[PDB]
Design a protein around this nucleic acid. Structure first.
Ligand SMILES: Nc1ccn([C@@H]2O[C@H](COP(=O)(O)CP(=O)(O)OP(=O)(O)O)[C@@H](O)[C@H]2O)c(=O)n1
Ligand SMILES: [Mg+2]
Ligand SMILES: [Mg+2]
Ligand SMILES: [Zn+2]
Lengths: 83, 48, 580, 21, 63, 237, 710, 226
RNA sequence: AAGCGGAGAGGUA
């Protein structure tokens, strides 16, 4: 698209993210579920391995899990089954 | 009682819209139809 | 973005800062970190910077009359004790900076943050959910800047001179860079007609069709424009593939441009264009030269003659009454008519006297603020005043606020301000009570499914057949037919179909319908839906705030009540301004 | 005036006051 | 009866409810807000709460 | 005294002839005393060469169209006014452009005299179709800035000499902006972003380097009033 | 707040009260201006809240009858000659005569210039009648306005709303440290300060014998001597500072009724509530958008707008069943680094600077089963600081009057100076009001030709639509007064200066002039004075005949393209400061019946999330934000601690529970003899009565109800 | 055409603290930016010396009074806020003021150490009637800009110390006037006249030298780009 | 290891 580089909360653009789902209300749960999975993986790193995997994309210097989840949704590394 | 529900709905929506159009306020008619729809959902029982 | 004081940020984010202090080994336990935060050691401002990044906050201002009273922003630490708010979000909140205050809330869990970051962000809510008109657009000073910039004044410096003999053209330029260099040297004005060679701006429709036709690949294709430099500098702010406008920017023109952008482009483009317009408007409002002084307030040249002419007639009526011909009411009505006519005549004389570059007239003419009644009151003649009961006092106020009212003219003029101040404080209760009842009646109407497959619907007039042999568009057609799905095929002349069933009625559909010659239409309405509980997304139609078909799970029964009850309450608290 | 040590503040007024506050 | 009681005329509503022995299904917005669970609108309906997220096979295998 | 924070100059190469420089962290209020001076010095201080007048045979009285050529006089003037030429000689130099036959007359047929060089040979000037002939005489001089058209002095002698504007400066566009940085707990320092776009004869880095050598020698005049003055020192590199 | 507010608190007529009206069920015909209020009750000054029209102020000349009816003075006119006899009339009688207007054209001999005059008839109607039957006249203009409304220059050029706002806002100004007097004002300031009672006035003539900062000793003419003491740095009802300073020398001779010492907001006997500032009127870069104000940095360096605020704290040592509380130094285990400022027997030392969380007086209370003691010393609340001025200690040992069961009472006074900063509120006399949006360095403000920067910038989009153009007239006249003028009358006198009193044809720089309320300077006289003004130290005239100057740009240096309106204006600092309005909280005290946070700033209190905000959240569709707001952040007693622990330890936030308010509601419904039950999917009403669940207290630190000890 | 002239600087004295400086011939348009660079530098970053704290004999804080002195402490501090002093040492230096008996305490009763001078020896500070004695101790330091008061407990000072606000810049007023020579033939140039008035603590020619040194140091970042 | 309810008055948006 013909837009300047987004900065902060506006990256990735919501116009691209909204093509991966069917509603604006499914994206919230999609990202929240993925973020919870990432956090659960992170905080039990020292103990017995858990099924949850991630992050799939290379994280930044210090990034909160929600941005990682959104950047994985944008890169098309996940898939969800609406219930 | 005389004409019917459709005439009542037309009358209500038009009468409500006139007041707001006089002062210069724009509201799409779809916002006044939920309320009017909610005002017509019952029946009085005559013989049981 | 928003600006947050360091003290408030430090107090709202205590648990996160304590966790980070323990993690980086700046403390030894959780009891040490709490004391370190309470005593505000210099080791607490190092981590606060990176613990608030990408964590949104919710800002709220009371009363919350509609949805856009709460919005989510990204915080940035500032020095001081006041919250900094963007200029463009002051119309949704209805906030001005003379003593207002706001409240700040913080989301905690992952779902709360996702909702604040996806649903409630301030860059996603630019259109009004009640009519679809943009709410984050230039206003006040920005309108004045954009109106000064894009204006052409005849006879200015460097104007194009179409002559021959000695100097061929004297005013054609080779690029905007050369024009800017000339303006810097002071041999040109940004409001003088010139001819430029543009290469990175798309031509209008007619020029594009006549010159290139197939496609104007604007990256490198050149054309000649006949315009001012301010208009080029204004067009360099709109998206790359947006045709050249070349008009003076009254407020309505800016509103139409914003509407078109929001309708045809994604949201990031509009959110990034409004900021550029803001910057340019603020920059050029300082150079516009609008200032108020007692010399700018001109007066009619012939007020005395008009006033004496009407005073003679008033005296005639009074004498006739005294002789015994008229009663009291007839005398009052005659005097009221005479004085209203006199005030209108003086207003017309004033409007005719004023020049066109006066700040007093320019501010109102550009659509920025105010009306002409206030200008007439300030520089012309106040007119007729009312009574405590509401009637008209036969004696008028023949002096403006520029000359200064006398003692009893100033006394009988206080009857009309007390009434406004008292009604403003007594009708708001009625407005709020009505809004609460409306919200409680219709709190269960929610979009439940996608389509009920019904054959029913309402009929909309959609323009009328003029007796002369033409069609006049219905005056109120954007509140009755726009944003509604069609219910039956629009068949004209029994020859073909213009719009098929299930099509949204936008601008092109309406224009094609009028061109084909269809007057009355049938559309799907919520009154005739067939769903047992709630409504469906096809009968309701298009969402006024987002422009797409309404989503499943929307609470369309609270937004309706808020949309109805906001304007009434808001107009109750602005009585004397301009009743309800 | 009428106060023993008041400062001098010249006035634009044209009328005369028969009575003091 | 909970919503009606919280709107107006609490005493009359409660007297009628007690005489009639009414029961409340708790399937609205006001009632859910009062008792403290998710409202049945927006991100609170079943089709949106019951979502399953898992990495794709190709991406999972790659890492 | 010492500032305690040495400023540094970065660079970002957007395009072969367009760059953005950044200076940070400047002390509070020093981003506005540098931006405007740098912009003005870049725009109207660096010398260059440009066309000053042209003479076209045939077109003597009327100034509307030249027979044999599709273009008119104004288009020819605009095409010639965007020539990127460089000259070392100080006196005015006269060059001739002669073209015959059907074809596109481009800037590569100028055949300049010694010294002057044309840096953009592939620029369209005109196009001859109806067996037209082009004979143009151009005058090239040197200067700095945007010296506009100069009224003809010896009008009677040289009747057809058409004066034009001159773009002497190699630099075409410059802009600046000022933002805020933290640099410790202060939070209110300054950062200066400067965007430069030049012509096809100099590079933006060289232009910036040449604009900061005419400003040192401008405030050297003030500094020579009193050598020992107790100013401010950034320090060694 | 200041002398004017106190003087206006009395002279106030109230319709409410026992035996009067009601604030809600009042109406609209009793809150209106009646034609019989002319001369007796001011129509402009009144509150703009729910008390509008139910509270008013007495007029300047009115008095009260023995029966209780208000009267006004009129000057009696007989057979067309205006006499000098004054008679006090009440509305009953005033409805029986015809009363002329105050500003009528008297012919310097007792006869009206023009027979046609506006008069007030029986029913309050005004009519134009020949000057033949009149029998009374007003004593003067300004006879229908109060004392606070008579201090606004150019009042007849403002609309009623903004005039009301300015009259109300003049009573909120805070005393400054210098208090200079206005350059252009009315004649009402001198009397409104002597009669308020905040100055010292000599009672009898004499020769001042000694003067200091503490007292003034005056030696009367009959051998008697009198000493006046002065109150220094005394706290006001509202926390401001009340000071008095002598303005006499050591040999001067005084007279009865002369002013001897100044007061809080007084300058040489005249009321002074603000300062004179140089103003330019223009939009500037968007920092004065929507009623915001741009300020210079010279007003912070030179303490132009600064004030002293004082605070008072109290503690009591009362008896109890287990023993007696006593203030001492032997506190339980606490670092000796914090017991440094406290003197030998408790209370802090005078002159010590204190911050938030410091100890003022050290009290210890018997804990209970000796050596069972607890710390309950007096601390400093959040966000407060300043020096300690004085300490007052009362005791029961020396037979002092104290309530029963209290042995000692201690009060500590803390003072601090306060500079102007972003968020503070400023206003003018004409209804202007705004907050400081920015404070700029001196070197990047628009400056005149001689190099003097402006002090404040006011936007031009708020003047025309609010109908208060007295401020631009005041700006013009203030510039003329500051610079001085001289009318050239060598060959006659100009036609526009025929009515100007002599001694007003020439002025020196920094003159002080007066503009009464309804007869002052006309626009012809102002336009004439603007054209004859003295130059600066050089032969330069900065402002032209229209009152506009050419300014430079402080950041770029390029001059602005058009001239701008420059002048001097009188600005006052209101008592709405941003230091008393910032508040934040994360966890603190909770209530008792319902476990929701407390409200207010005095105790750590939360912000109410009302019903309309819930409507907005439901309209957005945010179903998790609302649930989190209503359960774990407000009422869920078990979710609060778990949420805090999860946040501190970095794990995921848990799920909510059931709030306490629903349980309280069910208990009340059961107490009304109603059988409410919560059923399951197959009957079997849920117990909903707690249980034997995890009772662990992790995280050590108290959630926040109280502070944390070392 | 290329101009061979080079800009030059000349001075013209009007008084002991006012002066004018003439610069010519500049390029057309380059006359306001240079003047404003100089003016912005002169009004912010000229080093000077100022008082930093005071200590009176019998007073413990600012909100008090002295016996026999007609002013309280706060307005004595405000009167001292306008003292013009200069020093050349690089450490705080203490000055003493002692007065007894009837009279007028002015700035000429201060006895400065070696290296400090008081350039305003006639200003008014206080008045002592018959039983007032004043004994003040002042501290003087060097710096630049405006620095507010430094809290007592930050530096661990004593209890009778009274920190005061300090302003260091020795410049009073600066302005410029640009004279254009806009004629035909394209032979343009500019003249700049800069008028500087100082505080009597530094000659107006030295402030300009300091500003020029600062700017020449600062504009040297772009030159190293070579 | 420890407290925080009612009544009235005046203000800000
Ligand atoms: N009792 C009250 C009094 C005030 N308010 C709130 O404060 C504002 C008063 O605006 P205002 O009248 O003071 C100026 P404004 O409305 O912005 O119009 P203008 O810019 O053309 O001058 C309203 O928006 C109300 O929301 C309230 O909720 N209840
Ligand atoms: Mg407003
Ligand atoms: Mg407001
Ligand atoms: Zn349907």
């Amino acid at each position: 698209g013909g837009y300047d580089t987004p900065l902060g909360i506006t990256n990735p653009p919501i116009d691209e993210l909204l093509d991966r789902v069917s509603s604006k209300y499914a994206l919230v749960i999609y990202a929240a579920k993925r973020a919870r999975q990432i956090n659960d993986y992170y905080n039990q790193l020292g103990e017995g391995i858990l099924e949850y995997v991630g992050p799939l994309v290379e994280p930044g210097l210090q990034e909160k899990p929600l941005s990682i989840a959104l950047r994985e949704i944008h890169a098309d590394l996940l898939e969800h089954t609406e219930g | 009682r005389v004409q019917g529900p459709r005439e009542v709905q037309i009358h209500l929506v038009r009468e409500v819209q006139e007041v707001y159009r006089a002062q210069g306020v724009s509201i799409h008619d779809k916002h006044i139809e939920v309320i009017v729809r909610q005002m017509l959902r019952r029946v009085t029982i005559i013989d049981s | 973005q928003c600006g947050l004081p360091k003290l408030m940020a430090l107090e709202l984010f205590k648990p996160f800062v304590m966790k980070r202090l323990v993690d980086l080994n700046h403390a030894q336990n959780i009891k040490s970190a709490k004391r370190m935060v309470e005593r505000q050691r210099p080791q607490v401002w190092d981590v606060l910077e990176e613990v608030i990044a990408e964590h949104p906050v919710l800002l709220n201002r009371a009363p919350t009359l509609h949805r856009l009273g709460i919005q989510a922003f990204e915080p940035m630490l500032v020095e001081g004790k006041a919250i900094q708010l963007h200029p463009l979000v002051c119309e949704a909140f209805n906030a001005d900076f003379d003593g207002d205050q706001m409240a700040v809330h913080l989301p905690l869990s992952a779902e709360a943050q996702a909702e604040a970051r996806i649903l409630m962000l301030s860059s996603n809510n630019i259109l009004s959910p009640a009519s679809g008109r943009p709410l984050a657009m230039p206003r006040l000073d920005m309108v004045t800047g954009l109106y000064y910039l894009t204006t052409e004044v005849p006879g200015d410096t460097g104007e194009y001179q179409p002559a021959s003999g000695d100097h061929p053209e004297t005013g054609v330029y080779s690029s905007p860079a050369e024009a800017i260099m000339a303006a810097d040297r002071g041999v040109l004005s940004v409001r003088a007609k010139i001819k430029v060679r543009l290469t990175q701006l798309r031509p209008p429709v007619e020029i594009e069709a006549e010159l290139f036709g197939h496609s104007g690949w604007q990256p490198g294709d050149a054309w000649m424009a006949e315009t001012t430099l301010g208009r080029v500098m204004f067009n360099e702010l709109l998206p790359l593939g947006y045709p050249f406008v070349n008009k003076q920017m009254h407020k309505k023109v800016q509103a139409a441009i914003i509407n078109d952008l929001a309708e045809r482009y994604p949201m990031i483009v509009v959110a990034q264009t409004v900021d550029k317009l803001k910057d340019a408007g603020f920059y050029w409002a300082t150079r516009s030269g609008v200032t108020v002084s007692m010399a700018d307030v001109l007066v009619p040249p012939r007020k005395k003659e008009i006033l004496d002419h009407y005073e003679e007639r008033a005296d005639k009526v009074e004498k006739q009454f005294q002789r015994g011909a008229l009663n009291h009411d007839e005398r009052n009505e005659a005097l009221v008519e005479i004085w209203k006519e006199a005030t209108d005549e003086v207003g017309q004389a004033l409007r005719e006297h004023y020049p066109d570059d006066n700040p007093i007239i320019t501010i109102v003419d550009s659509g920025a603020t105010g009306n002409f009644t206030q200008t007439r009151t300030l520089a012309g003649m106040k007119g007729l005043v009312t009574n405590p009961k509401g009637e008209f006092i036969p004696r008028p106020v023949k002096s403006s606020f520029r000359e200064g009212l006398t003692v009893l003219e100033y006394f009988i003029n206080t009857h009309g301000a007390r009434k406004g101040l008292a009604d403003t404080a007594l009708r708001t209760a009625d407005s709020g009570y009505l809004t609460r009842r409306l919200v409680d009646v219709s709190q269960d109407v929610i979009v439940r499914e996608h389509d009920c497959q019904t054959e029913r619907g309402i009929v909309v007039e959609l323009a009328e057949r003029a007796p002369d042999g033409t069609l006049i568009r219905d005056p109120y057609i954007e509140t009755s037919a726009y944003a509604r799905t069609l219910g039956t095929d629009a068949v004209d002349e029994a020859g073909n179909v213009i719009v098929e069933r299930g099509q949204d009625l936008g601008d092109p559909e309406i224009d094609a319908l009028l061109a084909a010659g269809i007057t009355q239409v049938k559309v799907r309405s919520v009154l005739t839906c067939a769903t047992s509980t709630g409504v469906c997304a096809t009968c309701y139609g298009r969402s006024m705030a987002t422009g797409k078909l309404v989503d499943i799970g929307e609470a369309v029964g609270i937004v309706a009540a808020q949309s109805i009850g906001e304007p009434g309450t808001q107009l109750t608290m602005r009585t004397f301004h301009q009743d309800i | 005036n009428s106060v023993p040590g008041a400062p001098n503040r010249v006035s634009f007024a044209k009328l005369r006051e028969p009575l003091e506050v | 009866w909970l919503s009606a009681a919280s709107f107006q005329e609490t005493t009359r509503v409660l007297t009628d409810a007690a005489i009639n022995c009414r029961s409340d299904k708790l399937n609205g917005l006001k009632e859910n807000v009062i008792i403290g669970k998710l409202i049945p609108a927006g991100t609170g309906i079943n089709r949106y709460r019951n979502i399953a997220v898992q990495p794709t096979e190709e991406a999972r295998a790659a890492a | 005294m010492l500032i305690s924070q040495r400023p540094t100059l970065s660079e970002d190469v957007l395009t072969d002839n367009r760059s953005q420089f950044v200076i940070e962290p400047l002390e509070p209020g020093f981003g506005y005393t540098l931006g405007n001076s740098l912009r003005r010095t870049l725009l109207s201080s660096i010398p260059g060469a440009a066309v000053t007048s042209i003479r076209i045979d045939g077109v003597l009285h009327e100034f509307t169209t030249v027979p044999g050529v599709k273009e008119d006089v104004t288009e020819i003037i605009l095409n010639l006014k965007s020539l990127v030429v460089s000259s070392e000689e100080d006196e005015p130099v006269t060059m001739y452009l002669r073209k015959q036959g059907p074809g596109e007359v481009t800037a590569g047929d100028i055949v300049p005299p010694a010294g002057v060089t044309v840096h953009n040979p592939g620029m369209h000037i005109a196009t001859l179709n109806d067996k037209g002939k082009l004979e143009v005489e151009l005058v090239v001089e040197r200067g700095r800035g945007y010296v506009p058209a100069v009224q003809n002095r010896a009008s009677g002698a040289e009747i057809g000499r058409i004066p034009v504007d001159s773009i002497y400066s190699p630099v075409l566009k410059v802009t600046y902006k000022v933002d805020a940085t933290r640099v410790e707990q202060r939070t209110d320092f300054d950062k200066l972003i400067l965007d430069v776009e030049t012509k096809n004869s100099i590079s933006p880095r060289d232009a910036l380097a040449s604009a900061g050598k005419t400003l040192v020698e401008l405030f050297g005049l003030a500094r020579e009033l009193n050598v020992e003055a107790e100013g401010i020192e950034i320090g060694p590199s | 707040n200041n002398p004017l507010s106190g003087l206006t608190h009395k002279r106030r007529l109230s319709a409410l009260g026992p035996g009067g009206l009601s604030r809600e069920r009042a109406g609209l015909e009793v809150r209106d201006v009646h034609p019989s209020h002319y001369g007796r009750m001011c129509p402009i000054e009144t509150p703009e809240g729910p008390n509008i029209g139910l509270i008013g102020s007495l007029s300047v000349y009115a008095r009260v009858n023995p029966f209780g009816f208000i009267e006004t003075p009129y000057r009696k006119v007989v057979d067309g000659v205006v006499s000098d006899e004054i008679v006090y009339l009440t509305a009953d009688e005033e409805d029986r005569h015809v009363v002329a207007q105050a500003n009528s054209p008297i012919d310097a001999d007792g006869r009206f210039v023009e027979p046609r005059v506006l008069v007030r008839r029986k029913a309050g109607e005004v009519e134009y009648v020949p000057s033949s039957e009149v029998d009374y006249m007003d004593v003067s203009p300004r006879q229908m306005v109060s004392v606070a409304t008579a201090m606004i220059p150019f009042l007849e050029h403002d609309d009623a709303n903004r005039a009301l706002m300015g009259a109300n806002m003049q009573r909120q100004a805070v005393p400054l440290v210098r208090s200079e007097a206005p350059l252009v004002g009315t004649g009402m300031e001198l009397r409104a300060a002597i009669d308020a009672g905040d100055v010292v006035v000599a009672e009898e003539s004499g020769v001042i014998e000694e003067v200091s900062a503490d007292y003034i000793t005056v030696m009367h003419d009959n051998g008697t001597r009198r000493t006046y003491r002065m109150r220094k740095f005394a706290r006001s009802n509202h926390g401001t500072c009340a000071n008095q300073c002598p303005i006499v020398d050591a040999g001067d001779r005084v007279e009865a009724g002369q002013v001897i010492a100044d007061g809080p907001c007084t300058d040489d006997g005249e009321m002074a509530l603000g300062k004179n500032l140089l103003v330019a009127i223009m939009p500037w870069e968007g920092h004065n958008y929507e009623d915001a104000i741009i300020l210079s940095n010279r007003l912070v360096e030179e303490d132009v707008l600064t004030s002293i605020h004082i605070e008072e704290h109290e503690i009591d040592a009362r008896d109890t069943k287990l023993g007696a509380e006593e203030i001492t130094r032997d506190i339980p285990n606490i670092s000796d680094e914090v017991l440094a400022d406290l003197d030998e027997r408790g209370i802090v030392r005078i002159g010590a600077e204190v911050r938030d969380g410091d100890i003022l007086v050290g009290k210890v209370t018997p804990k209970g089963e000796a050596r069972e003691v607890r710390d309950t010393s007096l601390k400093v609340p959040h966000g407060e600081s300043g020096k300690v001025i004085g300490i007052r200690v009362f005791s029961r040992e020396d037979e002092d009057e104290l309530p029963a069961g209290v042995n000692e009472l201690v009060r500590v006074y803390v003072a601090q100076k306060r500079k102007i900063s972003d968020g503070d509120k400023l206003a003018g006399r004409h209804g202007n009001k705004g907050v400081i949006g920015k404070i700029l360095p001196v070197e990047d403000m628009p400056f005149l030709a001689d190099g003097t920067p402006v002090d404040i910038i006011l936007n031009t989009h708020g003047v025309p639509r609010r109908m208060n153009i007295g401020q631009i007239l005041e700006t013009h006249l203030g510039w003329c007064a500051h610079s001085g003028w001289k009318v050239d009358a060598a060959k006659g006198v100009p036609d526009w200066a025929a009515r100007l009193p002599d001694e007003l044809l020439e002025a020196q720089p920094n003159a002080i002039v007066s503009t009464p309320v309804f007869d002052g300077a006309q626009e012809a006289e102002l336009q004439g004075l603007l054209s004859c003004t003295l130059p600066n130290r050089d032969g330069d005239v900065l402002v032209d005949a229209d009152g506009k100057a050419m300014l430079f740009d402080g950041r770029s240096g390029e001059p602005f393209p058009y001239p701008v309106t420059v002048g001097y204006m009188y600005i006052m600092k209101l008592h709405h400061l941003v230091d008393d309005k910032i508040h934040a909280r994360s966890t603190g005290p909770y209530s008792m019946i319902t476990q929701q946070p407390l409200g207010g700033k005095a105790q750590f209190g939360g912000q109410r999330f009302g019903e309309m905000e819930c409507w907005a959240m439901q309209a957005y569709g945010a179903a998790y934000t609302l649930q989190e707001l209503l359960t774990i952040k407000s009422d869920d007693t078990v979710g609060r601690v778990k949420v805090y622990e999860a946040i501190v330890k970095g794990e995921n936030i848990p799920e909510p529970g059931i709030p306490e308010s629903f349980k309280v509601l069910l208990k009340e419904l059961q107490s009304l003899c109603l059988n409410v039950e919560v059923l399951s999917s197959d009957g079997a009403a849920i117990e909903l009565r707690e249980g034997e669940d995890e009772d662990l207290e992790r995280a050590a630190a108290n959630l926040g109800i109280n502070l944390s000890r070392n």
